[PDB]
Ligand binder design. Structure first.
Ligand SMILES: O=C[C@H](O)[C@H](O)[C@H](O)COP(=O)(O)O
Ligand SMILES: O=C[C@H](O)[C@H](O)[C@H](O)COP(=O)(O)O
Lengths: 148, 148
């Protein structure tokens, strides 16, 4: 599958590691930037990844900033996007199983590298469980329709 | 300040503990439910808290589900809402300082009680730092205006 990835300067180094991780595993990676350590604004890169996932240009996306919070909040503003900030593999599994998340958000200043690779591996392998969880994802779509 | 609180059945027991906690500290708490352990849909309660914060009926809100993820994704679909799933006090502090979060999301199946009270104590005390962080919050507002 095609994984879009994006970060601010706060998640740039962890993004470099995950892009490498994913390519080694034979995923196609689209890197939406940022492309160095200079200060940039996490909403710009959250948006590029979220719109790539929404357009079907990427199948899913991973967004990284210092904590994961800002970039995931920004990505969740896009209708049809469910971005999950995960700090352990349990949350990552559940974000796929229950929330059908199509963006994984991570925080480079919170999770160390090997932990974050473990979360990514879990998230990429977990599967949506449907049922009552589809009903709940629909109700998330209803909120989007209300404020649309 | 007036704190709105809400959960599904997955965050109901932790909600009870936090409501008690906040009252002992002299916060006015508005409990949006749910009001027992029967299975319910986290988007309904994320929405109620988010709309209370948005109307000014509550100053800030706390939403709880099994992981915090579904309920905070739902809350983040409301314009003007910035809901932060935090699993430690550092993320809670940053969600205020940097993201000016007006909703704290927690996961009852992820954080134990005393940890979760520590995160809430931190979040309620932390202050927005403005500056470049206000510029970035504005860009989240721009995504909202785009998809409005
Ligand atoms: O959620 C926002 C992210 O954590 C950022 O990477 C962080 O706010 C940027 O902080 P600073 O401007 O001090 O690098
Ligand atoms: O993010 C969704 C929350 O984790 C819920 O509390 C959880 O999905 C509900 O799971 P179940 O229906 O098995 O109680």
């Amino acid at each position: 599958m095609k994984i879009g990835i994006g970060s601010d300067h706060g998640g740039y180094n962890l993004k470099r590691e995950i892009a490498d991780f994913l390519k080694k595993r034979g995923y196609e990676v689209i890197d939406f930037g940022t492309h160095g350590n200079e200060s940039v604004d996490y909403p710009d890169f959250g948006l590029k990844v979220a719109e790539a996932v929404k357009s079907g240009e990427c199948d899913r996306g991973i967004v990284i900033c210092g904590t994961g919070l800002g970039i995931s909040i920004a990505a969740n503003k896009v209708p049809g996007i469910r971005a999950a900030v995960c700090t352990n593999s349990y949350m990552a599994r559940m974000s796929r199983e229950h929330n059908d998340a199509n963006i994984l958000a991570l925080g480079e200043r919170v999770v160390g590298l090997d932990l974050a690779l473990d979360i990514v591996d879990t998230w990429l392998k977990a599967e949506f469980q449907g049922g009552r969880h589809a009903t709940r994802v629909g109700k998330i779509g209803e909120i989007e329709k209300k404020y649309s």
